[PDB]
């Protein structure tokens, strides 16, 4: 290793010593990738060892098994678990691959060549070599496009994926005719993120998901070829800062946006995050409570279409500000919620009165009662319910865990983007270490600020 | 000066100001707690209470907080002041609706 | 009240403002 005497970096910034050491930086990267794959495999094996078949997995504090189940492995109708051997195989494959990646990372960190430029010019790079930077970016874009196409191939030919919108309570489905229409695909990304629109989080069917993945895979492959065979244009050269810290800051901003978006997916989306595996969303549980009390009081008669609340607005049913028949109470704020257990009960004007009177299915009743009893509310020591609840239920929603963790990660990575973007600008300009004390800029400016 | 409009120009004055703000704030809060020792509270705005008593439409966040304080006292008193021996039936506890 | 609070507020504004303005104008004429 190095020291502050030869690098100018203290130990708490010691990874900065790897900025201009290509081989050791590659070793740190590969060891880190091994760490990520290690956590994936170890957490998967932990979750399958602690998995209990009769209970829903969202009651068991699991976040990786819902992902693999959403891929359509070991699950059947209604998301009932049929086998855990696929999850075990996924965990084992990740653990062994992490051993290989850890060996590679340790090798390149310890006894590999310190810089790759002199002996391995294909892998050698300087940060200001914009052509080689776009070459590496192109290779990674091709790899990411191949991963998106792997998801597409899984959904199209290799068993499909779990459709929560399948009739009867959801099932693993082969997607036929994915939505490849450019208007439909790119209307998601220019949609507003506000209520009733939700930007890309509101993608509500597997056809749109798989078609968008076809689009993103093909675009990633094409952009990868483009960046292999092109050099950044003069406007890009003028606009950007070309250094390793600057590239890191760009990636930090991008992954901060992705982390915030993933938080929103975990909190709102029930298609890519089926409620059978992740538990209900907040809107889902509130609408489920309203639906459960409606069906209970209409079993008791009570004429739920005409019952009136204390405010006078409607105890069970009311109108949205655009006129749709919606559930009453504070769950009016969640009137835009769409779920497989409630969509068959809606017609063009919203909740249909005669359909809600006569067509309530037992599976819908059971699912709504379960989602009411398992709302995403709990304490961080995992006491289910609101903050006033007593210690009886050991439950926190995986949606809540994912949203909280990934909002925190997105925010810290935005802060890291700010730190590294500012430092990259200051280091490119030459004053990242301080003011020169002999050519101080402000001392040459006109006064009165 | 170019970001916020004003800036310190005197280092002395700045360090003092950094001394002065928390000490002054804590002394003001201590005076307020001394007022609370005698139950000399800034609890209510009497004009707004009059308007709320004479007008059932008038609601402010201050009136909401008065209701919340009433709930706090009523639901806290029996367990918090055992010497008062308050066996309050639930029918006198102020509640909202359903919840 | 409506008018005793009014005169209290007006006096609390004006008398310390008068004191501050006296000292400031004296200083600014001095320098």
């Amino acid at each position: 290793g190095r020291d502050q005497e030869t690098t100018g970096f203290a130990w708490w910034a010691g990874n900065a010593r790897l900025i201009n050491l290509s081989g050791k930086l590659l070793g740190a990267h590969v060891a880190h990738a091994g760490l990520i794959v290690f956590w994936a495999g170890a957490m998967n094996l932990f979750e399958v060892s602690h998995f209990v078949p009769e209970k829903p997995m969202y009651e068991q504090g699991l976040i990786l098994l819902p992902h693999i189940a959403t891929l359509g492995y070991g699950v059947g109708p209604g998301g009932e678990v049929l086998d855990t051997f696929p999850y075990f195989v996924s965990g084992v494959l990740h653990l062994i691959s992490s051993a290989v990646l850890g060996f590679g990372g340790v090798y390149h960190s310890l006894i590999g060549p310190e810089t790759l430029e002199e002996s391995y010019p294909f892998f050698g790079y300087v940060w200001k070599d914009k052509n080689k930077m776009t070459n590496i970016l192109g290779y990674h874009l091709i790899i990411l496009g191949c991963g998106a196409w792997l998801l597409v191939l899984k959904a199209l030919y290799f068993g499909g994926v779990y459709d929560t919108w399948a009739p009867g309570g959801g099932d693993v489905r082969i997607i036929s005719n994915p939505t490849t229409n450019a208007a439909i695909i790119f209307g998601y990304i220019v949609k507003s993120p506000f209520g009733g629109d939700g930007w890309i989080v509101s993608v509500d069917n597997l056809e749109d998901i798989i078609g968008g993945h076809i689009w993103i895979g093909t675009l990633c492959i094409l952009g990868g070829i483009w960046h292999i065979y092109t050099t950044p244009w003069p406007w890009a050269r003028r606009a950007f800062v070309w250094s390793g810290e600057a590239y890191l800051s760009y990636s930090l901003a991008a992954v901060s946006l992705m982390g915030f978006t993933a938080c929103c997916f975990a909190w709102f989306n029930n298609t890519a995050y089926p409620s059978e595996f992740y538990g209900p969303t907040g809107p889902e549980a509130s609408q489920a409570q309203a639906f459960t009390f409606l069906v209970r009081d209409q079993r008791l008669g009570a004429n739920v279409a005409s019952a009136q609340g204390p405010t006078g607005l409607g105890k069970y049913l009311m109108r949205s500000p655009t006129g749709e028949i919606i559930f009453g109470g504070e769950t009016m704020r969640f009137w835009d919620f769409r779920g497989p257990w409630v969509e068959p009960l809606r017609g063009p004007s919203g909740l249909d009165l005669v359909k809600l009177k006569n067509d309530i299915q037992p599976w819908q009743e059971r699912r709504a009662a379960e989602y009411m009893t398992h709302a995403p509310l709990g304490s961080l020591n995992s006491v289910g319910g609101v903050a006033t609840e007593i210690n009886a239920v050991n439950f926190v929603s995986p949606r809540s865990w994912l949203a909280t963790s990934h909002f925190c990660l997105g925010f810290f990575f935005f802060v890291g983007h700010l730190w590294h973007a500012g430092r990259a600008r200051a280091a490119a300009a030459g004053f990242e270490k301080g003011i020169d004390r002999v050519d101080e800029p402000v001392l040459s400016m006109r006064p009165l600020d | 000066s170019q970001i916020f409009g004003v800036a310190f120009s005197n280092k002395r004055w700045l360090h003092f100001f950094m001394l002065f703000v928390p000490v002054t704030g804590l002394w003001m809060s201590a005076l307020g707690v001394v007022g609370l020792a005698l139950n000399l509270r800034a609890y209510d705005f009497v004009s707004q209470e009059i308007r709320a008593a004479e007008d059932p439409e008038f609601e402010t966040f201050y009136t909401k907080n008065i209701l919340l304080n009433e709930g706090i006292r009523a639901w806290m008193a029996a367990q918090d002041q055992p010497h008062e021996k308050l066996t309050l039936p639930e029918e006198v506890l102020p509640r909202g609706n359903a919840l | 009240v409506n008018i005793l609070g009014l005169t209290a507020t007006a006096l609390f504004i004006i008398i310390p403002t008068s004191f501050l303005l006296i000292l400031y104008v004296k200083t600014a004429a001095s320098e």
Binding site: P447 | S1, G5, V6, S9 | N2, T9
Partner: peptide, 30 residues
């Protein structure tokens, strides 16, 4: 009446802010 007093006090505070920004005693570097 009281609304006038509140608005006047807020506007006077904003005027003091305006004067403290744009008519400050300039920091002299000598």
């Amino acid at each position: 009446m009281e609304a006038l007093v509140y608005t006047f006090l807020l506007i006077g505070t904003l005027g003091i802010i305006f004067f403290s920004i744009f008519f400050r005693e300039p920091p002299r570097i000598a």
